Each structure stands twice: as C-alpha cells, then as structure tokens.
C-alpha cells in the first residue's frame, strides 16, 4: 500500500489539478515498469504484479 | 483575499504548482507561495 497510495496521490496531483511536480514520481514508476519488462516473467491470477 | 487578487491559490493561473516541481507548502512566499501560518507563529517568530 505504501506505493499504491503514492501512485494514486501522484496521479491525482498530475492529472486533475496540475502540478509540475508529481511527474518525477510518475517517471520513477514508469522506469520501474520498463525495468520489469526487460525480462519476461509470467504471473497467474493470484500473482498479478 | 490576497490569493484571490494575485491568483496563487490552487485553481487560478498564477498557481506555482503547475509550473514548479515542488509542493505548494514547499514554495517560497515571494513566488506563488502558501502563506498559511498559525497566528502564534505569526506573532512570536515573525511574518516571513
């Protein structure tokens, strides 16, 4: 939850109300996504990451 | 009232948060700043 809350906060702060900040956080999150996609790793229904 | 006059509260054009990569609370008052302070701080410490 420490990251679900952070992502929701950053998205609500970038979309809707506009702040030049909260795009660095989105950048970090997208960087993590791009890290995850370097190596394929299957996950079933209970393990969706 | 002063935020309405200069438009620095969230919603009008001169709001810094849409232009600076930092929170409203962490913005200098000379720029679009949040002047929200307690009266006790405003009375003992000062204005700035």
Query: Dmax over Cα atoms in chain B, in whole Å?
Result: 33
Classify residue B27 as left (phi > 0), alpha (psi -120 to 50) or beta: beta
Q: How far is CA A33 from each of CA A5, A18, A30, A46, rounded to the nearest angstrom? A: 17, 23, 5, 19
Q: CA–CA separation, B8 vs B30, rounded Å? A: 11
Look at residues A29, A8, A17, A27 and name the one whose alpha carbon lies nearest to residue B18: A17
Give contacts of A19 with chain B, Cβ < 8 Å.
Answer: 17-18, 23
- φ, ψ for residue A40 (rounded to 5)? -70, 140
Q: CA–CA separation, B22 vs B3, rounded Å? A: 19
Residue B13 touches chain A, beta carbons under 8 Å:
no
In sequence order, the β-bridge partners of residue B12 are: B10
Query: Dmax over Cα atoms in chain A, in whole Å?
Result: 37
Experimental approach taken: cryo-EM
Determine whether the interchain pair B17/A24 forms a contact, defined as Cβ–Cβ distance below 8 Å: no
Kindly state the tokens that stand for A8: 């929701």
Kindly state the tokens that stand for A18: 């506009």
Residue A21 CB neighbours (<10 A): 20
């Amino acid at each position: 939850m420490s990251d679900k809350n952070l992502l929701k906060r950053a998205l609500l702060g970038y979309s809707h109300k506009r702040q030049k900040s909260m795009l660095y956080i989105l950048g970090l999150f997208k960087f993590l996504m791009k890290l995850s996609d370097e190596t394929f790793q299957h996950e079933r229904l209970g393990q969706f990451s | 009232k002063v935020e309405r006059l200069y438009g620095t509260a969230p919603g009008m054009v001169n709001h810094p948060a849409a232009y600076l990569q930092v929170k409203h609370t962490d913005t200098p008052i000379p720029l679009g700043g949040n002047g929200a302070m307690s009266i006790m701080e405003l009375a003992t410490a000062g204005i700035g």
